[PDB]
Amino acid sequence: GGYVAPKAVWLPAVKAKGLEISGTFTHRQGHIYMEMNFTNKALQHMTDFAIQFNKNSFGVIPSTPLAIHTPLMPNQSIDVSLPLNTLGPVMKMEPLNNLQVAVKNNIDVFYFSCLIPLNVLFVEDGKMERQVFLATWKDIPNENELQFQIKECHLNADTVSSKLQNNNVYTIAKRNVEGQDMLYQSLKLTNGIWILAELRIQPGNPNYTLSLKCRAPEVSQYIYQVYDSILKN
């Protein structure tokens, strides 16, 4: 499986009259989930749950209701796996992967925000054929190409490739040039955006150079973030 960030308290009890929601995002074999735990720290039950997300950059929306079907009793905790899809309304967020959520019960409507790790939006069919990669790389205007240093990285090229592939970042080609490993990689987002990469791993050099080309270059910074998180974990 891909990288999953540690669970975080998205909505602490103190902000929601005893309601506490902690969660993380996963991508399982097709499918995006918001994996959550709901705890009622109040003295009265909570029921009539509903959820909606603000319009957001990748059109993320719940695909089912919250699986909470009876009152959540004082001091009770329930684990809830909420499937999501990317067929909902779109609006640019800042940061790009920010997600504003509204949860209501019988007591009130509460609001929190959380970042969607950009990796959970990497699709399975993101492996570009070699020759299409070549044509696509050449076609993206070179002013779109942005370079990042993945600093202080102590992994080898095979481990780099294997970790990235576990997260739907595919190594399409490999070359060794002057003792430096060159990996050519591709990924595609849920909204159809293709990102192409050249990663250069140099002798005893602790900084890898990551060159990204994307027709939407504002996304590239976010992809660098992701590579860094994957390779550091």
């Binding site: 009539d48 749950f49 909606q52 719940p62 089912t64 209701p65 409507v109």
Partner: peptide, 15 residues
């Protein structure tokens, strides 16, 4: 806070 529309709420069924 952000503005919510009633029809965008995804309500849980009650058993």
């Amino acid at each position: 806070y952000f503005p919510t529309d009633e029809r965008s709420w995804v309500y849980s069924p009650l058993h």
